Amino acid sequence: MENFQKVEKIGEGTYGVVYKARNKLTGEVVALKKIVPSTAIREISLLKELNHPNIVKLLDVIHTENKLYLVFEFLHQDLKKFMDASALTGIPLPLIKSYLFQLLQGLAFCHSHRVLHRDLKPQNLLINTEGAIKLADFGLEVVTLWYRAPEILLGCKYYSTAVDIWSLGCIFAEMVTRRALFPGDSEIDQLFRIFRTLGTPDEVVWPGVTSMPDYKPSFPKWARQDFSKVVPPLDEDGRSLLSQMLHYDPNKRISAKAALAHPFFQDVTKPVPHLRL
Numbered sequence: 149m150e151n152f153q154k155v156e157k158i159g160e161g162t163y164g165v166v167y168k169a170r171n172k173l174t175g176e177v178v179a180l181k182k183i184v185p186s187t188a189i190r191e192i193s194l195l196k197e198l199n200h201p202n203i204v205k206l207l208d209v210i211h212t213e214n215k216l217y218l219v220f221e222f223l224h225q226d227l228k229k230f231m232d233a234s235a236l237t238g239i240p241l242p243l244i245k246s247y248l249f250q251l252l253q254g255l256a257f258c259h260s261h262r263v264l265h266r267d268l269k270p271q272n273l274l275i276n277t278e279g280a281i282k283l284a285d286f287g288l289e290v291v292t293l294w295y296r297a298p299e300i301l302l303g304c305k306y307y308s309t310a311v312d313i314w315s316l317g318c319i320f321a322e323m324v325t326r327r328a329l330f331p332g333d334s335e336i337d338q339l340f341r342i343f344r345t346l347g348t349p350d351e352v353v354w355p356g357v358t359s360m361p362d363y364k365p366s367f368p369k370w371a372r373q374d375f376s377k378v379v380p381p382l383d384e385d386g387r388s389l390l391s392q393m394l395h396y397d398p399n400k401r402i403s404a405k406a407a408l409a410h411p412f413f414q415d416v417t418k419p420v421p422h423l424r425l
Contacts, residue, residue: 202254227273256404268315303361310398317393347372385412
């Protein structure tokens with residue numbers, strides 16, 4: 149830890165502050181996070197071997213003086229900043245497509261190893277100047293509920309990889325319309341916003357939903373709206389994809405691997421974002 153020189157505070161993560169720093173003898177510029185239970189140590193160690201092009205590289209894990217420091221590769225900025233900056237004209241379609249595709253690649257990889265992200269949002273996606281987008285802050289201030297899957301909000305304790313597909317579909321809709329899809333400010337507000345758009349789920353569309361821990365028979369009964377009203381001007385291929393990523397039943401929700409083969413990605417390319425620097 150006397151090996152690193154803190155250059156600047158670049159963010160406040162879910163677990164600790166994150167700084168841009170320079171490795172004092174070797175010269176690399178890195179992102180340093182300062183977060184210890186043995187379980188945590190073993191879990192984090194297991195994250196060091198989960199390497200993929202669309203997963204922020206965890207370089208080193210320093211367990212010094214009974215505290216934990218994570219050394220990551222350094223990127224350009226988060227997706228939230230980019231979405232905010234592009235808000236007046238919107239992100240070009242080919243770039244939205246590129247980012248979605250790479251995110252499904254990273255999730256297909258995690259999910260094949262039985263690892264879920266669990267908290268996907270624009271705030272933990274990092275981009276670089278070359279057109280890459282990577283998953284960050286996974287496997288470890290009021291936190292956003294906007295991207296949370298319905299089974300989590302209904303009290304399901306053993307949720308699956310499908311919750312990451314839900315969250316990504318929420319991000320996808322927001323990139324296209326330039327507005328949060330379901331901006332709840334409480335768990336019941338989040339649920340009801342989902343219900344008003346997708347219709348109150350019942351035993352027809354989601355077998356077993358009414359048995360879920362926090363499900364209430366008294367929940368208002370809203371009807372489903374069309375996707376043509378939900379994500380205009382998205383084309384039919386994109387809408388067919390998004391609708392499958394937003395199925396209520398987790399066992400019906402498209403998988404990351406199936407998503408990669410959807411026709412929407414037939415003309416996928418890799419454009420360069422219009423960034424800073």
